[PDB]
Design a protein around this ligand. Sequence first.
Ligand code: NI
Length: 147
Amino acid sequence: GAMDGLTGATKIKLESSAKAIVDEIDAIKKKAASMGVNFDAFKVSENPFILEAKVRATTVAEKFVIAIEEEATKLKETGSSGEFSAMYDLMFEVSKPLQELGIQEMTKTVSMAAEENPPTTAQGVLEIAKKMREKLQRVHKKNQDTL
Ligand code: NI
């Protein structure tokens, strides 16, 4: 009676965009495996493939975060707590495979952002999305520039 999530076009748009990240990262992982590449961060990269991988992953992920920003903005006036919490859940969930590509601190970027500005409102979602997107962009640039 207060915990129901996304519906309609917003649900399809955001869940589809999130799934695209997971699909892309799964495919990157498979390519890596075929070439014997390990994304283990402890082992600015020197490896061309890892550079491309991070650009690819952060591109698809940023499209998702933009989708979050668009829908949170749309839902500012009439969106429910359950909808905003669901948007946070998608951001946090896709941060996990991103971190596994060696994007250090990705899940913490998201959860820490929610500590300052929790997803109880559109404003909160937008602040978390901004921090997530900024992090993606920083990673994107460093690796693209090197390339
Ligand atoms: Ni409910």
